[PDB]
Write a protein that binds this ligand. Sequence first.
Ligand SMILES: Nc1nc2c(ncn2[C@@H]2O[C@H](COP(=O)(O)OP(=O)(O)NP(=O)(O)O)[C@@H](O)[C@H]2O)c(=O)[nH]1
Ligand SMILES: NC[C@@H]1CC[C@@H](N)[C@@H](O[C@H]2[C@H](O)[C@@H](O[C@H]3O[C@H](CO)[C@@H](O)[C@H](N)[C@H]3O)[C@H](N)C[C@@H]2N)O1
Ligand SMILES: [Cl-]
Ligand SMILES: [Mg+2]
Ligand SMILES: [Mg+2]
Length: 288
Amino acid sequence: ATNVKAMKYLIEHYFDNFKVDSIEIIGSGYDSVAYLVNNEYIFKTKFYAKEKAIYNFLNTNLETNVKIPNIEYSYISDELSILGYKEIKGTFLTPEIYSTMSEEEQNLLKRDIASFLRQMHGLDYTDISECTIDNKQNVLEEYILLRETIYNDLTDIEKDYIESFMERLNATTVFEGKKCLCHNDFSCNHLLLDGNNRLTGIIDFGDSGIIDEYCDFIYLLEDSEEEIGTNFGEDILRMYGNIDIEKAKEYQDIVEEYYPIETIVYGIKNIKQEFIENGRKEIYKRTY
Ligand SMILES: Nc1nc2c(ncn2[C@@H]2O[C@H](COP(=O)(O)OP(=O)(O)NP(=O)(O)O)[C@@H](O)[C@H]2O)c(=O)[nH]1
Ligand SMILES: NC[C@@H]1CC[C@@H](N)[C@@H](O[C@H]2[C@H](O)[C@@H](O[C@H]3O[C@H](CO)[C@@H](O)[C@H](N)[C@H]3O)[C@H](N)C[C@@H]2N)O1
Ligand SMILES: [Cl-]
Ligand SMILES: [Mg+2]
Ligand SMILES: [Mg+2]
């Protein structure tokens, strides 16, 4: 409990009347830690301005019964960011849980998801218009960073994987469609169910932005151990409606192809050799 103690100190220091009676680590990424405090509050911390701006925009503008974080505590500085909000109660959706649900239960969950996405994507985003993300341009810039750093030391197999991806990226039309506000990390580990297996809450709008509409289906369409599966995403797309399903799948496939490169780039930017090695190894796994 050393981490817990430092974070208890920081919370009490920056939020003057707040008393920490209990505190435990509830999740962690590679450069963030999330804490459950007093069995009631979530504090996300990092060594978060946009994320806060997004919860504020959404809590003003969304009409939905699905719960999202409502920021009550914030401290934001160059060196440290903390966001605190009341824990949304529920069970996180998993493949295992989904497989035990009746067909009707599954259908209601899919409809709840489609409905939420439709409402969010339909919001007039003028008041959040600073939060724009261009994925194609971001990729080009990450490629330039590769070229400026480690590209010349990569193997021919690694180089070909990258150049083949850039060729595909250049030819695709999937970045030319509707833009809207997306969650942009819409995976089942961010989806909470209530006791009837109905969608009750959504978390982690940390990557959210004005971006391609296709983006919020990337994980719903993913075939992996962590996600439900492609059929889940297809059905949600049909319920959501007025969207080109083949292009949504093309978008997901291109993003999936990019993953190893994204991993390499993260390692370069954050000076973490482990990630550079992991992404390069994953290129070999995918090639063979
Ligand atoms: N049940 C519950 N758990 C929460 C809540 N908020 C966060 N969590 C838990 O804490 C984990 C981390 O929260 P999350 O917003 O995803 O943060 P992160 O993804 O680790 N950090 P970042 O989004 O900055 O990279 C979640 O996966 C979940 O376990 C909440 O409202 N309810
Ligand atoms: N762990 C192995 C899986 C296999 C499939 C691959 N597509 C990826 O899939 C996960 C994907 O990475 C997850 O997003 C993480 O990563 C993103 C960037 O990479 C971050 O911006 C994001 N905020 C972070 O939480 C997603 N939430 C759930 C997906 N199952 O890894
Ligand atoms: Cl390496
Ligand atoms: Mg998360
Ligand atoms: Mg996140």
